[PDB]
Structure 1
Amino acid sequence: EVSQDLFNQFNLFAQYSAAAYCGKNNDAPAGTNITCTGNACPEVEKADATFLYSFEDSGVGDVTGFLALDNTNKLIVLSFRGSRSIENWIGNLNFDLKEINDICSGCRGHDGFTSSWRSVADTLRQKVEDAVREHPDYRVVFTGHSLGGALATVAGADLRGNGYDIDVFSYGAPRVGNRAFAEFLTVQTGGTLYRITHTNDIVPRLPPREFGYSHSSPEYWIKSGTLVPVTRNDIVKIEGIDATGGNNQPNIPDIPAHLWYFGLIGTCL
């Protein structure tokens, strides 16, 4: 239902996201090639892909991830890890909203997601600008799964509009703010957000609409099951803020579906 070029991009960045969990040693130097345990990021390994900066429990929100130069696919990639324990993070998930009038002219976002990022926006904005300078023709791309999804989405909306396009690929990200933020994430210029969801994954169903949260449009919904390989015919585009007929169904939700995005994610073999 979407292009092959798009499928390749979705798979590629899903693997970059998984590397945020299974890319051995955050206490690694800058410069060394990027590798994963248990076949988590084969397409990332195939490419000339090295670390530029690694960060762990960084800031007030204990943010984790890496900045990567890919010289094969011509990308600069900021990748956010999600929670080391999703079950917990889900149960412990606070629903409070906060005003974000810097980013957004009348928007409320999730206090935790907004705060974790805001505490590291400065350093990480610098790290990206140095790369963007060193590689003007390289695509700047922000990506993440679960918590990392949200964080990427917030960084993307906060750092866009500065001369360089920032594209956002998020994987099972939760709702990140209110109706207005949803619209600002839908029409914002300086990139494209591809908000990927999988079947009855529970996380892109939280915090609930019933708490003021709303989903940006569109959504790229993966129909194929958990532990099933994904083909471009299993992904459906869904237009409309808080659309239904995708991840937003009245049915019974599921945690495993959250951990299978094109391949294993959010945990490491």
Structure 2
Amino acid sequence: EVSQDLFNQFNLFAQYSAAAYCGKNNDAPAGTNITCTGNACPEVEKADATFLYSFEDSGVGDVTGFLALDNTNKLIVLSFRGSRSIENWIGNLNFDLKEINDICSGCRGHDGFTSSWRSVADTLRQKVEDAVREHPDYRVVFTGHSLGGALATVAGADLRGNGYDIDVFSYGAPRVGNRAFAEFLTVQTGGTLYRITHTNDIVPRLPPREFGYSHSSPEYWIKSGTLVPVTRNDIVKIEGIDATGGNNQPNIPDIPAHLWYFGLIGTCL
């Protein structure tokens, strides 16, 4: 339901997203090769990818992640890590919205995710600009799973049209703002947003629509089971804001589904 090529990018950034949790980045030297424990990111290892900068508990919302260069694929990946503990993170979740005219007008976004990014958008924006210029023929990409996915999306909105096209791949990302914002994310130029969901996974269902949140379009839904391998024939593109019939359905949601995006994600073996 997507091309073999699109599937491959979904799989590759699924792993880049995974690395935010299982790569040994902790205070890892700039320039080092990116590796992950427990086979979390083989395709990243299979490439000429190195850390260009790494961050932890960075800024006011404790953002954590890393920026990287892929000479094999010609990319400049910014990966955001989600919570060290997603289950608790899910229950501590606050649904409060906050004015974000700066991104767009009449756009309201999750206060937490937005504050977290502004606080770090300065340090990180420059680190990114330095890279395109060196690798201008290299696709810049923003990625993240769970909370990390939300952070990647906000950054992907806050940073478009400065010169370079920013593509975003999010995995099991929560809703990030109000209907206006979803509208924006669905049509914004200077990039494409790939919002990937899996089976019933609960995070893409929060905050609720009943708290004023809304999802951008389209949605790339993975129909294959938890712990089951994903083929191109298992993903479905679902068009239209807040479309239902994908991950946005009225059944009982699940947390394990959130940890399986093409592989093991959000946790390390």
TM-score class, shorter-chain normalisation, is over 0.9
Percent identical across equivalent pairs? Answer: 100
Give, in angstroms, the shift of residue 134 of structure 1. 1.0
Tell me the TM-score normalized by structure 2: 1.00
The CA deviation at 1:251 is 0.3
Q: Give the SS at the match of 1:196.
A: strand
| 1:128-153 CA distance string (max 9 Å, x none) | 00001111111000000000000000
Distance 2:220 2:110 in 1: 22
* Separation of aligned partners in 1, 2:190 and 2:144: 19
Instruction: Note the C-alpha offset of 1:261.
Output: 0.2
Quote how far apart the aligned CAs of 1:106 are.
1.3
Task: Measure how far apart 1:25 and its partner are.
Answer: 3.2
Listed as ranges, the matches of 1:12-161 within 5 Å are 12-161=12-161
Cα separation, 2, equivalents of 1:194 and 1:149:
10
SS of equivalent to 2:76? strand
Compute the displacement of 1:168 (Å). Answer: 0.2
CA distance in structure 1 between the aligned counterparts of 2:3 and 2:99, rounded to whole angstroms: 37
Secondary structure at 1:261's aligned position in 2?
coil
Tell me the distance in 1 between the aligned counterparts of 2:65 and 2:3.
Answer: 29
- Alpha-carbon separation, structure 2, partners of 1:79 and 1:161: 20
Deviating 4+ runs (over 2 angstroms)? none
Count residues in correspondence: 269
User: In the alignment, is the contact (CA less than 8 A) between 2:25 and 2:54 conserved in 1?
Assistant: no
Cα distance in 1 for residues equivalent to 2:234 and 2:240: 19
Question: d(CA) in 2 for partners of 1:238 and 1:127?
Answer: 34
Deviations 1:201-220 (A, max 9, x none): 00000000000000000000
SS of equivalent to 2:233: coil
C-alpha RMSD over aligned residues: 0.4
Asked if 1 retains the 8 angstrom alpha-carbon contact of 2:35 and 2:44, the reply is yes
**Cα offset for 1:105?**
1.4
Give the match's secondary structure for 1:120. Answer: helix
Instruction: Give 1:112-261 correspondences, 5 Å limit.
Output: 112-261=112-261
Distance 2:244 2:102 in 1: 30
